[PDB]
Design a protein around this ligand. Structure first.
Ligand code: MG
Ligand code: MG
Lengths: 247, 246
């Protein structure tokens, strides 16, 4: 969803001061920007300081759709910041509830839960490990065989981020039975899915010998070879990289 | 540390989350979401308004306050998620931050290192951008700073870089960081050697090629000697890393 900044915004003239030659104007504008950024982070931190996270995690068990969905947006949002903010989400016990919400008959709830997991798995290796431990992988994989393309795309993005951890985190993806589904996804009519399936296999390929062979066993060499000649240009530029590192 | 103002609505909202009343639960979640949406849109408005490239340009300012103030703003943005980190790199920050790494002024150097740490706490391509910008040669050279505040920030940065994939871990090894990392185990500072242990354990998360390089540096010798330490918490981390070589 795109927005317009309000008409009374001071930001444009503030940006002009930064680019100016005056150096009183330069100093004034950097101070105002530092204030805006400090204020914005502090409002986010105050919510965490307030003890909101564990109470929001509780509300993930709400029978009410409205409440569960808003509490889910809030957590996803926090988990989209730095590592420290993901840690707070994890510490509040979000993961088991987030993993459980992958069984939700609601397609809107499933997608928001998948986006939350992606955010958390975009952090450090031990935080991706936490996700793995919570048993996210068995559900993520079965969700790769989904008729719903929009769900598939987010489940795929969540695996890629897990697949961008250490070798042991990558191996957990392999052990979960992810490759057959990923390789099949290189036959996707939808181009955007192909590219994320590509980037997922590319992230796995950044592992050691064991991870590479597993990808060769799944039949990914054959595909990337006779895929390096697809209609699109950047789908060839990324399949060339996904084939070259497997060396 | 700071206090929130007495008029803050947050405590009554938190209690509304934990209540049995669904209406109060729903009013509180919507309000928390609103607050979070607002803060994140304040930060994005600064980016959408084209500030970053201009702040990067002010990293080469002859004025002490300006340079310092711009570096904090850049550092602050880089402490968010990957999307915000990328905007900083796109703005051209890394070259300027690396050049600032060899500046007379001590606090400027420290903030420069803090900034680079923030950037290296993102994804692998982001950490690789730090490496391609030439950060490592300077970083290792700072591992024996007579200033210990500067030593601990430089350590943090290397841990972050070494917390990437195998390609970035090998780069740290290739830059000759292991000997100095090992020598920081037998050092008086209990907070520093802990960060050096964090650092070494992160390398030990790589492959065999990475695991063996640490061994040739004399890690296993000084890792086992750390079970005779006064502190109980160091005794755990030394083991969690010593055994991390299965
Ligand atoms: Mg191989
Ligand atoms: Mg809202």
């Amino acid at each position: 969803s795109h927005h317009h900044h309000h008409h009374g915004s001071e930001l444009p003239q503030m940006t002009q001061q930064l680019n100016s030659d005056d150096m009183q104007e330069q100093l004034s504008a950097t101070r105002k920007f530092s204030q805006i950024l400090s204020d914005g982070n502090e409002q986010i931190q105050a919510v965490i300081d307030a003890g909101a996270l564990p109470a929001l995690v509780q509300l993930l068990s709400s029978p009410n759709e409205q409440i569960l969905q808003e509490a889910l947006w809030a957590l996803s949002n926090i988990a989209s910041g730095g590592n420290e903010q993901i840690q707070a989400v994890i510490d509040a016990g979000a993961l088991p509830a987030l993993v459980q919400l992958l069984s939700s008959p609601n397609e809107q709830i499933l997608q928001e839960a998948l986006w939350a997991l992606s955010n958390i798995a975009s952090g450090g290796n031990e935080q991706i490990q936490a996700v793995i431990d919570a048993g996210a992988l068995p559900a993520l994989v079965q969700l790769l065989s989904s008729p719903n393309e929009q769900i598939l795309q987010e489940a795929l993005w969540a695996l890629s981020n897990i697949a961008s951890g250490g070798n042991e985190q990558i191996q957990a993806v392999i052990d979960a039975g992810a490759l057959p589904a990923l390789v099949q996804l290189l036959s996707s009519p939808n181009e955007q899915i192909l590219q994320e399936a590509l980037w997922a296999l590319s992230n796995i390929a950044s592992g050691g010998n064991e991870q590479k062979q597993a990808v060769k066993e799944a039949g990914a060499l054959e595909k990337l070879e006779q895929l390096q000649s697809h209609e699109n240009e950047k789908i060839q530029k990324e399949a060339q990289e996904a084939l070259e590192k497997l060396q």
